[PDB]
Design a protein around this ligand. Structure first.
Ligand code: SF4
Ligand SMILES: [Zn+2]
Lengths: 118, 677
DNA sequence: AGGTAGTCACAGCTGATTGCGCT
DNA sequence: GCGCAATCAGCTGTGACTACCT
């Protein structure tokens, strides 16, 4: 059996465990806010995570492939668990610390590059 | 000679061994020592079978207890006969190099039509009636009545085999199918029955895929033969596809008409137990209800039995007893012949499957037909969606299942398309004294316009003109036959009609003859024959066909036949019929397979399969061109087999028509020179 | 009364960004 | 929306021209 992290009730299988190896039962599955799923590009832009940090740093981060409502023939969206993405970003960049200044100086350098191009 | 692997010595008929063959043998020995499954990929049609058989024999000699039974399932009968004769050559080499015989038995299995001696059943071309006539001639009741010596026409081979062929075994001597037929006719025994009696006391045995993928016969042909056994599916690059055909059935008006015609005869014979007699009568009306319903599509694999149990109020359990009825009730009825009875059997099998197998399947109804869309044609498909169901029984019964073919470029998709645990991830690229192939991707034409076969540009005049110009000025540099493949029959016929309308097809006509492949089997065969005879002399010819056709895999273009193979656009399967999309959804929500990635994989797999048949043998050489800029993209080049990637230099990935022609001329000129061994 | 670190030209490389394509 | 290829930033090699101390 698997012990849920929230209720502690033993269970055999759960949706999150099958797709993300998360020991959380469907009763405690807060998929609306706590277990929100975001697109691959959104995670890369917000958390400055590269492919290697998403696929090669242990543990590997799984994703769910879902159809795109805008266009079915377009690239199917990949959804990652927000908690896992946050944990990976914290393990790579430390914390909510100077990484913010790092992205600030990144956009400052982008402005520097555009003004130099002008 | 005697190849010395780290813990064994293996005899090989050929003194010279290519490094690829040695690496393949090392990898296969590693897999056998690993006691696990795997997937392999080789670029040569010949030379793989001899190496596989030699290593199997060496492993059996070294470890008789570890391996007891070997299976070499192939696609068709020519492969079976060629591997049988290759095994015969290997055994002859072993005998001539050692001097003493060994108790090894090798037999080939096929349908009853292939292995039969009665002259009253050979001439007919009914594959569904040979089994019925064979069962009628000899069965349990025939054996029971043979005690009184009834004067009736019946098969007598079994009546002699059961008293004379079940005592003398065949410890040694590998026998081909014709050899088995000769032995049966000289001993008055049935080849099929002696094959059934001899598989238990045998070393190796080969047959086709349908004897393992179809559960209705695999259990009968292999139940307790060997717990520790080795099976291989050579040339199975489309195995999953045929796996679908293992659990896919279709229903039409002819089937229900035949059923309603024959049920009256069945009832008349009965009145001359009751748990099924009245059960079968009202089964047809439920499925004919959908005939009168004009609806687009209905999908309810779990709820279909619910609708059945609501309309007619039948429990699900008796359906599971339908199959065991076939061997119980029918033998009491003494059916004269299985003709006009097969639809009933397939309906019973369909009912049993939908009662049992409904987790990963889908029921589809299509009110569409070719050239007669909506007149009368509701087609019901119990289409399969997961290839694991057709592959689980062989994986749970065998230890080292190996999947090998000429095109298995993505080794990461097969283990996730079907439940698999590969431990090999091995690819092999053939090498010779010179580069025998010159693959190249031709992008934009002389007008600097892409020649991509996009759906929005299928009717574009510019791409059609570019394709015509490419086929014209290409036909003057490569001699004696060019094989061109189009995306579909509709696109192919539209393009040739457009070429006929312009004054461009006539220019191609004077260089090479134009031959068109159609759906007719006889027409296709005669077109292939005339193409072969035209390529034999200096006239030269062009064979235009489709990538997804029976001619794509039915023939191999040996050297001097089809020096050039042209791909006009990436061949994409049609998204209609609501069959591909169901599989895409199942792979998305079950195996997390990208729809675009799967479509690209299928397209490139078909393209590589139809383009890699121009290289058969070391001395053979050929040219391979792709007439689409989409092939230049990395996501599609990566799907090509490894033995073609290294020969596809980055210099020619988007070159125009003229430079492609120059490259072809240079390659042919430099490959026309003699070489060495 | 006689010699070398910056500076300039023209190429290379790798490390990211960054608009373009879609059966 | 995702994925592949085009683009630039930064650093370096090669060879030559030029402004202040023994
Ligand atoms: S028992 Fe054998 S020989 Fe006789 S009809 Fe059947 S297949 Fe032919
Ligand atoms: Zn819980």
């Amino acid at each position: 059996y698997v012990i849920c992290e929230e209720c502690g009730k033993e269970f055999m299988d759960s949706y999150l465990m099958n797709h993300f190896d998360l020991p959380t039962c469907d009763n405690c599955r807060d998929a609306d806010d706590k277990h929100k799923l975001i697109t691959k590009t959104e995670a890369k832009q917000e958390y400055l995570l590269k492919d290697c940090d998403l696929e090669k740093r242990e543990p590997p981060l799984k994703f769910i492939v879902k159809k795109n409502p805008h266009h079915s023939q377009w690239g199917d969206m990949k959804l990652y668990l927000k908690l896992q993405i946050v944990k990976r970003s914290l393990e790579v960049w430390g914390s909510q610390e100077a990484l913010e200044e790092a992205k600030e100086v990144r956009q400052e350098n982008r402005e520097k590059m555009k003004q130099k191009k002008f | 000679m005697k190849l010395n692997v780290d813990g064994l010595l293996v005899y090989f008929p050929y003194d010279y061994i290519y490094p690829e063959q040695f690496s393949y043998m090392r990898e296969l020995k590693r897999t056998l020592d690993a006691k696990g499954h795997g997937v392999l990929e080789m670029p040569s049609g010949t030379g793989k079978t001899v190496s596989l058989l030699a290593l199997i024999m060496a492993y059996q000699r070294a470890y008789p207890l570890e391996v007891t039974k070997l299976i070499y399932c192939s696609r068709t009968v020519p492969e079976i006969e060629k591997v049988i004769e290759e095994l015969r050559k290997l055994l002859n080499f072993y005998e001539k190099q050692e001097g003493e015989k060994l108790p090894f038995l090798g037999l080939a299995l096929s349908s009853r039509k292939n292995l039969c001696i009665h002259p009253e059943v050979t001439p007919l071309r009914f594959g569904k009636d040979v089994d019925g006539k064979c069962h009628s001639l000899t069965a349990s009741y025939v054996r029971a009545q043979y005690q009184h010596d009834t004067s009736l026409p019946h098969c007598r081979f079994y009546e002699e085999f059961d008293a004379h062929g079940r005592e003398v075994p065949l410890p040694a001597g590998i026998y081909n199918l014709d050899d088995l037929k000769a032995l049966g006719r000289r001993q008055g025994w049935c080849p099929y029955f002696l094959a059934r009696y001899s598989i238990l006391h045998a070393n190796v045995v080969v047959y086709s895929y349908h004897y393992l993928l179809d559960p209705k016969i695999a259990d009968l042909v292999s139940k307790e033969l060997a717990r520790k056994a080795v099976v291989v599916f050579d040339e199975a690059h489309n195995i999953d596809n045929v796996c679908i055909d293992s659990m896919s059935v279709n229903l039409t008006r002819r089937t229900l008409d035949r059923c309603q015609g024959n049920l009256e005869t069945l009832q008349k014979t009965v009145l001359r137990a009751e748990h099924f007699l009245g059960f079968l009568r009202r089964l047809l009306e439920y499925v004919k209800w959908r005939l009168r319903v004009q609806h687009v599509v209905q999908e309810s694999p779990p709820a279909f039995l619910s609708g059945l149990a609501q309309r007619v109020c039948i429990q699900r359990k008796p359906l599971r007893f339908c199959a065991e009825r076939l061997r119980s009730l029918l033998h009491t009825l003494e059916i004269t012949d299985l003709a006009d009875f097969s639809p009933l059997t397939l309906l019973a099998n369909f009912a049993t499957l939908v009662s049992t197998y409904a987790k990963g399947f889908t029921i589809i109804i299509e009110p569409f037909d070719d050239r007669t869309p909506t007149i009368a044609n509701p087609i019901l498909h119990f289409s399969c969606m997961d290839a694991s169901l057709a592959i689980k029984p062989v994986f749970e019964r065998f230890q080292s299942v190996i999947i090998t073919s000429g095109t298995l470029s993505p080794l990461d998709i097969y283990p996730k398309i079907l439940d698999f645990h590969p431990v090999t991830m091995a690819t092999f690229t053939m090498t010779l004294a010179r580069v025998c192939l010159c693959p190249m991707i031709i992008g934009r034409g002389n007008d600097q316009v892409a020649i991509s076969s996009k759906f929005e540009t299928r009717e574009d005049i510019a791409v059609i003109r570019n394709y015509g110009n490419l086929l014209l000025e290409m036909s003057a540099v490569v001699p004696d036959g060019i094989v061109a493949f189009f995306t579909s029959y509709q696109y192919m016929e539209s393009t040739v009609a457009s070429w006929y309308e312009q004054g461009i097809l006539e220019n191609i006509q004077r260089n090479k003859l134009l031959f068109i492949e159609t759906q007719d089997g006889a027409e296709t065969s005669v077109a292939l024959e005339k193409y072969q005879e035209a390529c034999e002399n200096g006239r030269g010819a062009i064979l235009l066909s489709v990538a997804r056709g029976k001619v794509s895999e039915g023939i191999d273009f040996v050297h001097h036949y089809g020096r050039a193979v042209i791909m006009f656009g990436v061949p994409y399967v049609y998204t209609q019929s609501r069959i591909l999309k169901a599989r895409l959804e199942y792979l998305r929500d079950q195996f997390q397979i990208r729809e675009n990635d799967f479509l690209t994989f299928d397209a490139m797999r078909h393209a590589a399969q139809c383009v890699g048949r121009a290289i058969r043998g070391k001395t053979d050489y050929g040219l391979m061109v792709f007439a689409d800029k989409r092939f230049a993209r990395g996501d599609k080049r990566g799907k090509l087999p490894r033995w073609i990637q290294e020969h596809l230099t980055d210099a020619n990935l988007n070159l125009t028509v003229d430079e492609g022609v120059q490259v072809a001329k240079y390659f042919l000129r430099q490959m026309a020179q003699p070489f060495h061994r």
